[PDB]
């Protein structure tokens, strides 16, 4: 019973939980994020994940291939999924570069982010305890910004390519290359350690968080909504995007993984178990982070909203602080970042495998013709690496933020989710889909799933996608920095590179297929056997 969950759950429990959810929650002012978060969870999160698993089992094919047997017109969903994955794999691994650099910096008698007598520091520094006594700065935040990140004043100023992080990206990509080449997977005796250790570390950090003198204010900030001010579009898209990103839906790798599953199991109950497990770990890491932030507010004498970066760096500001308040800091630092790498890589391997096993479908007689696969993996890793380098320049943080918002996040996931639900529920037919599910697992989806696909999910996706474009506000890196319009254009280009796959494939397949126009439409709407 546990063996399967222990093996597979690590594939998409990952940085989305321990890293992304906390900084998106902080960015959106804490507890206000939870309302739309759970609304999306129980409206579209679990049902759409179940639907993806059902598609995977039903069609036994990857994203590029399966939709041919459901609705040929909307096969563009496969290319959208594959390109979303091909963009996620580029920037998702950059987080592991920072984690690796932190880990290699941990091998010291005293941690570099514990004090600010070190060289890279501004003269405006003071140790947190001394900030009680202005423009004062905290050693952890400026370590993050100037040693690890060496943050340039803007995306317009890429600066030098940091060799110490470039070699980290190389190391992580070599790990991925050899693991995917050798077919390494969580099935050996190491599975227990690899799957259990992250949760033990999360328990440790949870207890370290709640015990601190300032934890209560942090939890109050974490759990108290402000509905009267914060119900702008940003929180709604961020919550829906977080749900869709964490469950890895609309990526197509879920359908690829699901194709290996067995139909004899109670897929419904297992989907509920996996969803509850993942959302619970996210929600609990929320307590850990925000109790640490409450302590930072207590110690520094600034409001909780101002203590740390309102951006990707939050985890690398919060946890590095936490390990500075535990006995023998170096031991916990090494454990934490080895844990973070083990948590991220086990999921990075799954996407990369999905990417390869999907791309082979574009030319199986040429890419899968033999030894070529061992070279194709090297090609994919090389191209992803050389694109990753852009995020490792001194200005790379802004590029990473732009990618993290637009490339595999935001309106594009809403777009793909809307089209999946719309196709299956209305073009293919919810009743036909329920009959197929009856054949597969022996019982119909029921009302919750049926209405989630037919009404709730389309309404939520379209509502957010419209609301933001009505109440639009642009991206920022921290609370202050505003992107130039050309960078916003690049971000929208990353987003649209996946969205346009559906309309363009519709056009391509209408034009290619013969006959009068209604014949074309009907012939491409009706499923292949």
């Amino acid at each position, epitope marked *: 019973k546990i063996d399967f969950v222990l093996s597979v759950a690590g594939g998409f429990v990952g940085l989305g939980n321990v890293w992304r959810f906390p900084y998106l929650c902080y960015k959106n002012g804490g507890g206000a994020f939870l309302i739309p978060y759970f609304i999306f969870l129980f409206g579209s999160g679990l049902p759409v994940f179940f639907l993806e698993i059902i598609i995977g089992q039903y069609t036994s094919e990857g994203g590029i291939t399966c939709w041919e047997k459901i609705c040929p017109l909307f096969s563009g969903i496969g290319y959208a999924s594959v390109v979303i994955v091909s963009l996620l794999n580029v920037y998702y691994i950059v987080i592991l570069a920072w984690a690796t650099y932190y880990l290699f910096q941990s091998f010291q008698k005293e941690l570099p982010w514990a004090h600010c007598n070190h060289s890279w520091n501004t003269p405006h520094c003071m140790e947190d305890t001394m900030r009680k006594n202005t423009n004062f700065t905290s050693p952890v935040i400026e370590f993050w910004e100037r040693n690890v990140l060496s943050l340039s004043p803007g995306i317009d100023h890429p600066g030098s390519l940091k060799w110490d992080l470039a070699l980290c990206l190389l190391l992580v990509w070599l790990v991925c290359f050899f693991c995917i080449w050798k077919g390494v997977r969580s099935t050996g005796k190491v599975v227990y350690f690899t799957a259990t250790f992250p949760f033990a570390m999360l328990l440790v950090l949870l207890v370290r968080g709640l015990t601190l003198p300032g934890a209560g204010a942090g939890i109050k900030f974490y759990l108290y909504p402000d509905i009267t001010r914060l119900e702008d579009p940003q929180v709604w898209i961020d919550a829906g995007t977080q749900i869709f990103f964490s469950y890895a839906i609309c990526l197509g790798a879920m359908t690829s993984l699901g194709s290996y599953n067995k139909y004899h199991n109670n897929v419904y109950r297992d989907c509920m178990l996996l969803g509850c497990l993942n959302s619970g770990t996210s929600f609990v890491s929320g307590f850990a982070i925000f109790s640490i932030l409450g302590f930072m507010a207590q110690e520094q004498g600034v409001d909780i909203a101002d203590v740390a970066e309102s951006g990707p760096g939050l985890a690398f500001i919060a946890y590095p602080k936490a390990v500075t308040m535990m006995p023998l800091p170096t031991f916990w630092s090494i454990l934490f970042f080895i844990m973070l790498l083990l948590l991220g890589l086990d999921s990075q391997f799954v996407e990369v495998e999905g990417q390869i096993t999907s791309l082979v479908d574009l030319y199986p007689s040429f890419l899968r013709k033999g030894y070529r696969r061992e070279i194709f993996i090297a090609f994919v890793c090389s191209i992803s690496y050389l694109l990753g380098l852009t995020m490792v320049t001194e200005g790379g943080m802004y590029v990473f933020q732009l990618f993290d918002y637009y490339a595999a996040s935001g309106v594009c996931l809403l777009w793909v989710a809307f089209f999946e639900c719309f196709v299956i529920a209305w073009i293919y037919g919810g009743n036909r889909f*329920s009959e197929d599910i009856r054949d597969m697992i022996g019982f119909p989806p029921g009302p919750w799933m049926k209405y989630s696909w037919a009404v709730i999910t389309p309404v939520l996706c379209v509502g957010c996608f419209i609301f933001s474009l009505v109440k639009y506000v642009p991206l920022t890196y921290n609370k202050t920095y505003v992107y130039p319009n050309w960078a916003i254009g690049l971000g929208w280009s990353l987003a649209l590179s996946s969205m346009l796959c559906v309309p363009l494939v519709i056009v391509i397949r209408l034009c290619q297929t013969e006959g009068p126009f209604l014949v074309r439409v009907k012939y491409l709407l009706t499923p292949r056997e």
Partner: antibody
Amino acid sequence: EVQLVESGGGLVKPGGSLKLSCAASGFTFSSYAMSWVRQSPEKRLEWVAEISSGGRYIYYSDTVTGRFTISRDNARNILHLEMSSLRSEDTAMYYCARGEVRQRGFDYWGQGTTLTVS
Amino acid sequence: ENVLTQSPAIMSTSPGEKVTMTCRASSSVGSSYLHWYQQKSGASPKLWIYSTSNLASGVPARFSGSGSGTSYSLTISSVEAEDAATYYCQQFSGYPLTFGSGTKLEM
């Protein structure tokens, strides 16, 4: 209250053909899979054929897979079974049964109709 | 086809006594896919148990079931004259669907 009522059973010569009917009421007939189950004169039960809720998937027992055709009429809310060449072993009492959830057995059974091949 | 057989085809019984009967399969059947039906003399069968243990809507609480894999059983805590009937075990895991040989309580 749910209702199931078979009809059309009767007397046939060996190798003859006959068509059974099973009227349904009290539930959305298009939303539930339906099955025919057969009781021998020795009172032994045997399964015959299942038709899915919509009708895209159909299953037959190996003893009838070549001779019996199942069908449904969702608009008329009636279940049909057609027998092409009734062998000596096919004489029995035929029940139509509602079977949507495989993890919940057959929910309800019709009154049934006898069939004889004398 | 997965043949199912039931152990005590015919059974003597008296009111108030406890009763038990078993069902065996030629192949393993999941806990969720085996069901029991009651047939009164000269009447259509009715669903009686629809899992390893789950009781039907109208069955008296005195009934119970158990088992997994290749073996299953049904039991009655204390019988009554109203329970004189024939009981069939049925597997729902894989086609062709099969009913057990059935067991009759004679009193």
